[PDB]
Design a protein around this motif. Structure first.
Motif, mmCIF file in Angstrom:
data_model
loop_
_atom_site.group_PDB
_atom_site.id
_atom_site.type_symbol
_atom_site.label_atom_id
_atom_site.label_comp_id
_atom_site.label_asym_id
_atom_site.label_seq_id
_atom_site.Cartn_x
_atom_site.Cartn_y
_atom_site.Cartn_z
ATOM 1 N N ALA A 1 0.824 -1.199 0.000
ATOM 2 C CA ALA A 1 0.000 0.000 0.000
ATOM 3 C C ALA A 1 0.869 1.264 0.000
ATOM 4 N N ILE A 2 1.917 1.247 0.802
ATOM 5 C CA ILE A 2 2.913 2.304 0.803
ATOM 6 C C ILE A 2 3.503 2.492 -0.600
ATOM 7 N N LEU A 3 3.912 1.390 -1.229
ATOM 8 C CA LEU A 3 4.426 1.398 -2.602
ATOM 9 C C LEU A 3 3.439 1.987 -3.626
ATOM 10 N N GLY A 4 2.196 1.486 -3.623
ATOM 11 C CA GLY A 4 1.137 2.014 -4.482
ATOM 12 C C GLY A 4 0.895 3.497 -4.265
ATOM 13 N N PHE A 5 0.832 3.919 -2.999
ATOM 14 C CA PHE A 5 0.710 5.341 -2.670
ATOM 15 C C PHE A 5 1.848 6.173 -3.276
ATOM 16 N N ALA A 6 3.074 5.677 -3.153
ATOM 17 C CA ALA A 6 4.261 6.414 -3.593
ATOM 18 C C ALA A 6 4.277 6.610 -5.115
ATOM 19 N N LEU A 7 3.976 5.537 -5.841
ATOM 20 C CA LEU A 7 3.931 5.549 -7.304
ATOM 21 C C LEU A 7 2.802 6.441 -7.832
ATOM 22 N N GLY B 1 1.501 13.011 -9.199
ATOM 23 C CA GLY B 1 1.179 14.319 -8.661
ATOM 24 C C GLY B 1 2.413 15.197 -8.579
ATOM 25 N N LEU B 2 3.526 14.612 -8.124
ATOM 26 C CA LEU B 2 4.820 15.301 -8.025
ATOM 27 C C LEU B 2 5.230 15.905 -9.381
ATOM 28 N N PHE B 3 5.170 15.105 -10.441
ATOM 29 C CA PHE B 3 5.479 15.592 -11.781
ATOM 30 C C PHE B 3 4.622 16.775 -12.250
ATOM 31 N N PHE C 1 -6.632 9.335 4.311
ATOM 32 C CA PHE C 1 -7.280 10.651 4.174
ATOM 33 C C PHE C 1 -6.233 11.778 4.080
ATOM 34 N N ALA C 2 -5.232 11.753 4.958
ATOM 35 C CA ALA C 2 -4.288 12.867 5.032
ATOM 36 C C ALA C 2 -3.429 12.971 3.774
ATOM 37 N N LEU C 3 -2.995 11.828 3.252
ATOM 38 C CA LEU C 3 -2.209 11.808 2.021
ATOM 39 C C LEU C 3 -3.038 12.258 0.792
ATOM 40 N N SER C 4 -4.289 11.824 0.719
ATOM 41 C CA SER C 4 -5.203 12.265 -0.354
ATOM 42 C C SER C 4 -5.478 13.784 -0.303
ATOM 43 N N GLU C 5 -5.842 14.274 0.880
ATOM 44 C CA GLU C 5 -6.078 15.699 1.101
ATOM 45 C C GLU C 5 -4.893 16.581 0.704
ATOM 46 N N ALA C 6 -3.688 16.148 1.075
ATOM 47 C CA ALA C 6 -2.477 16.898 0.765
ATOM 48 C C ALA C 6 -2.358 17.278 -0.726
ATOM 49 N N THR C 7 -2.736 16.360 -1.622
ATOM 50 C CA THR C 7 -2.721 16.614 -3.069
ATOM 51 C C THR C 7 -3.568 17.845 -3.412
ATOM 52 N N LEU D 1 -4.264 20.182 -1.166
ATOM 53 C CA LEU D 1 -3.624 21.337 -0.511
ATOM 54 C C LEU D 1 -2.484 21.910 -1.352
ATOM 55 N N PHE D 2 -1.810 21.060 -2.131
ATOM 56 C CA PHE D 2 -0.822 21.535 -3.103
ATOM 57 C C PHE D 2 -1.458 22.353 -4.238
ATOM 58 N N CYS D 3 -2.702 22.029 -4.597
ATOM 59 C CA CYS D 3 -3.507 22.835 -5.529
ATOM 60 C C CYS D 3 -3.822 24.218 -4.962
HETATM 61 C C1 LIG Z 1 6.953 9.811 -4.954
HETATM 62 C C2 LIG Z 1 7.626 10.303 -3.679
HETATM 63 C C3 LIG Z 1 6.665 10.209 -2.495
HETATM 64 C C4 LIG Z 1 7.291 9.502 -1.457
HETATM 65 C C5 LIG Z 1 6.692 8.419 -0.814
HETATM 66 C C6 LIG Z 1 7.344 7.756 0.227
HETATM 67 C C7 LIG Z 1 6.747 6.677 0.870
HETATM 68 C C8 LIG Z 1 7.349 6.005 1.943
HETATM 69 C C9 LIG Z 1 6.448 6.127 3.226
HETATM 70 C C10 LIG Z 1 7.003 5.229 4.344
HETATM 71 C C11 LIG Z 1 6.315 7.630 3.686
HETATM 72 O O1 LIG Z 1 7.610 8.178 3.974
HETATM 73 C C12 LIG Z 1 5.305 7.949 4.865
HETATM 74 C C13 LIG Z 1 3.939 7.288 4.606
HETATM 75 O O2 LIG Z 1 5.807 7.454 6.122
HETATM 76 C C14 LIG Z 1 5.126 9.360 4.899
HETATM 77 O O3 LIG Z 1 4.643 9.918 3.908
HETATM 78 C C15 LIG Z 1 5.508 10.135 6.035
HETATM 79 C C16 LIG Z 1 6.835 10.867 5.762
HETATM 80 C C17 LIG Z 1 4.441 11.179 6.413
HETATM 81 O O4 LIG Z 1 4.966 12.095 7.378
HETATM 82 C C18 LIG Z 1 3.110 10.534 6.952
HETATM 83 C C19 LIG Z 1 3.404 9.506 8.062
HETATM 84 C C20 LIG Z 1 2.163 11.499 7.398
HETATM 85 O O5 LIG Z 1 1.749 11.462 8.562
HETATM 86 C C21 LIG Z 1 1.657 12.481 6.512
HETATM 87 C C22 LIG Z 1 0.133 12.320 6.324
HETATM 88 C C23 LIG Z 1 2.013 13.920 7.009
HETATM 89 O O6 LIG Z 1 1.513 14.108 8.333
HETATM 90 C C24 LIG Z 1 1.471 15.025 6.077
HETATM 91 C C25 LIG Z 1 1.767 16.410 6.675
HETATM 92 C C26 LIG Z 1 2.081 14.931 4.827
HETATM 93 C C27 LIG Z 1 1.332 14.844 3.661
HETATM 94 C C28 LIG Z 1 1.998 14.752 2.442
HETATM 95 O O7 LIG Z 1 1.350 14.653 1.403
HETATM 96 O O8 LIG Z 1 3.350 14.740 2.464
HETATM 97 C C29 LIG Z 1 3.930 14.659 1.157
HETATM 98 C C30 LIG Z 1 4.169 13.174 0.763
HETATM 99 C C31 LIG Z 1 4.838 12.395 1.909
HETATM 100 C C32 LIG Z 1 4.985 13.126 -0.549
HETATM 101 C C33 LIG Z 1 5.252 11.692 -0.999
HETATM 102 C C34 LIG Z 1 6.370 11.650 -2.037
HETATM 103 O O9 LIG Z 1 6.219 13.891 -0.389
HETATM 104 C C35 LIG Z 1 6.008 15.311 -0.183
HETATM 105 O O10 LIG Z 1 5.251 15.912 -1.267
HETATM 106 C C36 LIG Z 1 5.961 16.035 -2.551
HETATM 107 C C37 LIG Z 1 5.086 16.606 -3.679
HETATM 108 C C38 LIG Z 1 3.827 15.741 -3.826
HETATM 109 C C39 LIG Z 1 2.811 16.436 -4.740
HETATM 110 O O11 LIG Z 1 4.179 14.467 -4.373
HETATM 111 C C40 LIG Z 1 7.243 16.850 -2.359
HETATM 112 C C41 LIG Z 1 6.948 18.317 -1.954
HETATM 113 C C42 LIG Z 1 8.062 16.128 -1.272
HETATM 114 C C43 LIG Z 1 7.291 15.918 -0.108
HETATM 115 O O12 LIG Z 1 7.765 16.243 0.979
HETATM 116 C C44 LIG Z 1 5.218 15.493 1.155
HETATM 117 C C45 LIG Z 1 4.821 16.953 1.417
#
Ligand SMILES: CC[C@H]1/C=C/C=C/C[C@@H](C)[C@H](O)[C@@](C)(O)C(=O)[C@@H](C)[C@H](O)[C@@H](C)C(=O)[C@@H](C)[C@H](O)[C@@H](C)/C=C/C(=O)O[C@@H]2[C@H](C)[C@H](CC1)O[C@@]1(O[C@@H](C[C@@H](C)O)[C@@H](C)CC1=O)[C@H]2C
Ligand SMILES: CC[C@H]1/C=C/C=C/C[C@@H](C)[C@H](O)[C@@](C)(O)C(=O)[C@@H](C)[C@H](O)[C@@H](C)C(=O)[C@@H](C)[C@H](O)[C@@H](C)/C=C/C(=O)O[C@@H]2[C@H](C)[C@H](CC1)O[C@@]1(O[C@@H](C[C@@H](C)O)[C@@H](C)CC1=O)[C@H]2C
Ligand SMILES: CC[C@H]1/C=C/C=C/C[C@@H](C)[C@H](O)[C@@](C)(O)C(=O)[C@@H](C)[C@H](O)[C@@H](C)C(=O)[C@@H](C)[C@H](O)[C@@H](C)/C=C/C(=O)O[C@@H]2[C@H](C)[C@H](CC1)O[C@@]1(O[C@@H](C[C@@H](C)O)[C@@H](C)CC1=O)[C@H]2C
Ligand SMILES: CC[C@H]1/C=C/C=C/C[C@@H](C)[C@H](O)[C@@](C)(O)C(=O)[C@@H](C)[C@H](O)[C@@H](C)C(=O)[C@@H](C)[C@H](O)[C@@H](C)/C=C/C(=O)O[C@@H]2[C@H](C)[C@H](CC1)O[C@@]1(O[C@@H](C[C@@H](C)O)[C@@H](C)CC1=O)[C@H]2C
Ligand SMILES: CC[C@H]1/C=C/C=C/C[C@@H](C)[C@H](O)[C@@](C)(O)C(=O)[C@@H](C)[C@H](O)[C@@H](C)C(=O)[C@@H](C)[C@H](O)[C@@H](C)/C=C/C(=O)O[C@@H]2[C@H](C)[C@H](CC1)O[C@@]1(O[C@@H](C[C@@H](C)O)[C@@H](C)CC1=O)[C@H]2C
Ligand SMILES: CC[C@H]1/C=C/C=C/C[C@@H](C)[C@H](O)[C@@](C)(O)C(=O)[C@@H](C)[C@H](O)[C@@H](C)C(=O)[C@@H](C)[C@H](O)[C@@H](C)/C=C/C(=O)O[C@@H]2[C@H](C)[C@H](CC1)O[C@@]1(O[C@@H](C[C@@H](C)O)[C@@H](C)CC1=O)[C@H]2C
Ligand SMILES: CC[C@H]1/C=C/C=C/C[C@@H](C)[C@H](O)[C@@](C)(O)C(=O)[C@@H](C)[C@H](O)[C@@H](C)C(=O)[C@@H](C)[C@H](O)[C@@H](C)/C=C/C(=O)O[C@@H]2[C@H](C)[C@H](CC1)O[C@@]1(O[C@@H](C[C@@H](C)O)[C@@H](C)CC1=O)[C@H]2C
Ligand SMILES: CC[C@H]1/C=C/C=C/C[C@@H](C)[C@H](O)[C@@](C)(O)C(=O)[C@@H](C)[C@H](O)[C@@H](C)C(=O)[C@@H](C)[C@H](O)[C@@H](C)/C=C/C(=O)O[C@@H]2[C@H](C)[C@H](CC1)O[C@@]1(O[C@@H](C[C@@H](C)O)[C@@H](C)CC1=O)[C@H]2C
Lengths: 75, 75, 74, 74, 74, 74, 74, 74, 75, 75
Positions: free
Chosen positions: F51-57, F62-64, H55-61, H63-65
């Motif tokens: 799920a973490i992996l799917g979320f990241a991908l 969105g990042l792009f 919810f928090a990860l979805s909402e963040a997208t 919030l970037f908008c």
């Molecule tokens: C493709 C890369 C993605 C990385 C995924 C990594 C997954 C591994 C897992 C274990 C994570 O590290 C995870 C789930 O623990 C995690 O996200 C941690 C770091 C995070 O603090 C979790 C626990 C959390 O509580 C969230 C909800 C946090 O409280 C909240 C404020 C962050 C929301 C958010 O969307 O963060 C972005 C996201 C991690 C994204 C995710 C990026 O990163 C951030 O947003 C991106 C831009 C967005 C549009 O992708 C950029 C600004 C860098 C960021 O800091 C950040 C800004």
């Protein structure tokens, strides 16, 4: 001349949007094909021609979009 | 020739929208392959080629979009 | 005349967007046909004409889009 | 010059819209992986490579959008 | 008045977009008809008129779009 | 150069649209995680990393979008 | 005068887009009616008035779009 | 300066479209939470934090908008 | 003041797009009410008020759209 | 003055599009509430607070759209 050519080209790009329908639609059909065969392997020969038909009809809608696209670009 | 060039570039951008269809579609097909094989492992060799066919036909709609995009960019 | 002709060609392109509905719709019908026949093979002859009716009515909505597109084009 | 440059930037923006397909599609693939593994844990090794293939092909559609985007930008 | 006629034509193209809802809707209705008859053949005579009704109401929304579209074209 | 800067700003607004895919995708993944753990609690440690992996991908897409958006803004 | 008139016609067209919601939504209601009656024919009399209420409320959203459309046109 | 300022305000509006993704997405997560707890009450304490994360990860997208919208506005 | 008036009218049109959300939403709520009561007739009196609440909250998003539309048209 | 005011009003209409998300989202939540209570009436008091929370969070995204809408119209 300028304004008309420009419009033709903006129109052609817009004309490809409807293709998203066939992209999603073709997939919906093959998904049902796959799940139906998984549940009931013996029905394969009955439903596969149904999926080919479904795909072709759905794809036809994308074709119509692409036809307009090409008419704008060339015709 | 400024207005026309400008129109080619905006049109190329617009032409990629339709790719979201293949994006979702391809995924739909593979989702069904995964769910189908989960429910019935022994059907794998039968449904995998169906998923490949499904992928290819949904992908084609994306190909057409990108083709128009590249015709606007270069052709 | 240029501006109007330009508006005709933009409009014709926009007129094809609605075809995505028949694309998805025609598929929704055939998906049901396939799932219904898989679950219950003996129902085929009953539901196949229902799928034909459903596909044709869905497609028509997209043909009304195409109609408008052609009116603008020509 | 400036109208063409403007068009490139607008076009680059429009060009990222299609990335929403990959975003949803990657999720669709992982959703099925998760549900498939939950219903039948022993199928994991069989479906994981399928999920890899699926999301890679889905993600690629988004990279094509991005290809056009970066062509327009640079 | 080039501007006004232009607006009628573009506006006519835009008015067809809503037809996609009828395209998908009609399909949703026939899909359910097919699934319902597959699960329960004896219910056919009861649900078929319901499906016709659902199709007609969903189709009506397409009709209204085409209506605005034709009003702008003529 | 009013035209060019204008184009950068509008284009920046458009570039955020694709983020909706990440919004829906991420949700699709966590939904499946939740449904899968509900049906089969003992599978949690296996599907959670998936799920973490799917979320990241899905998030990457969105990042792009945001990347193109920031490139146009600055 | 003519730019304002043009805007009205464009606006009238854009105003029909929301009708796609009613088109899909009416279908969603009838789909559930059909599936509900197929699974449990004896519930028909109970769910039919619910389906009437549901599609009427869904259709109304489309009529509001059409209200604006016709305000812009006349 | 007018044209650029105009482009900033148009862009800011366009920048909010992407929020529809978090709207739908946040709901998809809570829907799964509700269905998962209905089917299996004893799983609640395990999946509730998963829903909060999702919810928090979805909402963040979304919030970037909003972030981009505010950058353009101010 | 032509350009501004023109913008009010196009804006009013655009403001109605969001109503498609309530259209689909309201339907989703009633679909669940129907399916829920089909599966479990005796739950009707419990879920009907939930469906009404659900309707009202989804409808409100449409209300806000139309409010902006009318503020652009008249306000 | 003209061009800026006009842009503010076009922007405000565009800002309401995102509300469709909350319209659909609020409904998805109440649907799950209804189906979950139908399947398991005794879980009602546990899931109803979950639906209120879900609705409020989803609705918050529409609020943000409407805030931008109002900032453009007035601020
Ligand atoms: C493709 C890369 C993605 C990385 C995924 C990594 C997954 C591994 C897992 C274990 C994570 O590290 C995870 C789930 O623990 C995690 O996200 C941690 C770091 C995070 O603090 C979790 C626990 C959390 O509580 C969230 C909800 C946090 O409280 C909240 C404020 C962050 C929301 C958010 O969307 O963060 C972005 C996201 C991690 C994204 C995710 C990026 O990163 C951030 O947003 C991106 C831009 C967005 C549009 O992708 C950029 C600004 C860098 C960021 O800091 C950040 C800004
Ligand atoms: C509504 C008519 C449709 C026809 C349906 C026919 C159904 C019958 C079945 C048996 C097919 O022919 C089928 C499944 O065998 C088939 O598609 C064949 C031709 C195909 O080679 C299959 C076996 C195959 O392996 C595919 C996946 C192939 O590898 C791949 C390169 C083709 C993708 C594709 O999208 O083809 C289009 C499509 C058939 C479509 C299909 C159109 O045709 C092509 O696309 C059209 C325009 C599109 C936009 O409609 C045009 C460019 C010319 C084409 O040949 C073509 C370009
Ligand atoms: C009819 C259209 C499609 C035809 C499909 C045929 C499928 C049959 C099966 C057996 C394939 O060969 C398959 C499954 O093995 C396959 O896709 C192979 C070639 C692929 O390498 C797979 C295994 C893979 O690892 C992918 C994910 C690879 O790592 C990644 C870099 C490529 C992604 C991609 O989308 O490529 C396109 C795709 C094959 C598409 C698929 C085209 O083709 C490419 O992209 C197209 C344009 C896109 C928009 O269609 C164009 C540039 C030419 C291409 O080479 C290519 C560029
Ligand atoms: C179909 C093409 C895509 C590739 C699919 C590959 C599938 C195979 C499997 C093994 C994957 O690579 C996978 C799942 O392991 C994976 O994503 C790896 C690379 C990743 O490290 C895993 C462990 C991970 O947790 C990721 C999500 C990590 O948390 C995060 C920091 C990186 C996210 C990411 O999305 O990477 C991009 C993406 C794969 C994209 C998408 C490429 O590639 C990256 O960006 C591109 C360029 C930009 C324009 O895309 C280039 C720099 C290479 C990249 O690393 C990169 C930038
Ligand atoms: C809200 C009013 C709708 C009426 C519904 C009536 C339902 C009752 C049932 C019993 C029908 O009469 C039904 C199912 O038998 C039926 O449609 C018949 C007449 C029809 O011929 C069926 C059997 C049929 O085979 C279809 C597929 C036919 O072959 C195909 C050419 C027609 C497609 C079509 O979309 O027709 C439209 C539709 C009936 C629609 C439906 C309108 O009407 C047409 O299209 C509308 C405009 C569209 C956009 O609504 C307008 C031009 C008038 C039309 O002739 C017509 C053009
Ligand atoms: C929530 C408001 C909507 C009404 C919902 C009513 C629900 C109650 C039930 C009883 C219905 O009225 C219902 C199902 O019986 C029904 O639709 C009736 C009227 C209809 O005759 C049934 C038997 C039928 O088969 C229809 C579909 C018939 O085939 C077709 C010719 C009419 C379709 C139609 O969509 O009517 C419109 C719509 C209800 C719309 C939608 C109104 O109304 C009509 O158009 C409006 C004006 C335009 C601008 O909408 C006005 C002339 C009154 C209308 O007749 C009309 C023009
Ligand atoms: C918080 C927002 C919503 C409040 C809902 C409250 C629901 C509680 C329950 C008990 C309702 O009262 C309920 C279910 O009885 C109900 O809707 C009643 C009033 C309604 O008459 C039902 C039974 C009915 O028959 C409908 C289908 C009627 O036939 C049809 C003509 C009206 C459709 C409609 O959408 O009306 C709007 C709606 C009640 C909406 C619903 C508003 O209000 C109206 O439309 C709003 C604008 C829309 C876009 O929200 C505005 C013009 C004022 C309205 O009177 C009204 C105009
Ligand atoms: C993110 C914060 C949200 C708050 C959530 C609160 C959850 C707690 C629970 C207990 C609620 O308060 C709840 C269910 O009781 C509730 O909504 C109350 C206030 C409401 O009266 C309920 C019982 C009710 O009957 C509804 C259906 C009422 O009939 C109807 C007129 C209200 C519809 C509505 O959409 O209200 C908005 C919403 C609460 C939203 C809710 C915002 O607030 C309003 O809309 C906001 C802006 C919108 C776009 O977010 C603004 C105009 C002012 C508002 O009061 C308001 C306008």
């Amino acid at each position: 001349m300028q304004l008309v050519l420009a419009a033709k080209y903006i129109g052609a790009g817009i004309s490809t949007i409807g293709l998203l329908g066939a992209g999603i639609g073709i997939a919906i059909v093959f998904a049902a094909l796959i799940n139906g065969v998984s549940r009931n392997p013996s029905i394969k020969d009955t439903v596969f021609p149904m999926a080919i038909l479904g795909f072709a009809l759905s794809e036809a809608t994308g074709l119509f979009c692409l036809m307009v696209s090409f008419l704008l670009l060339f015709g």
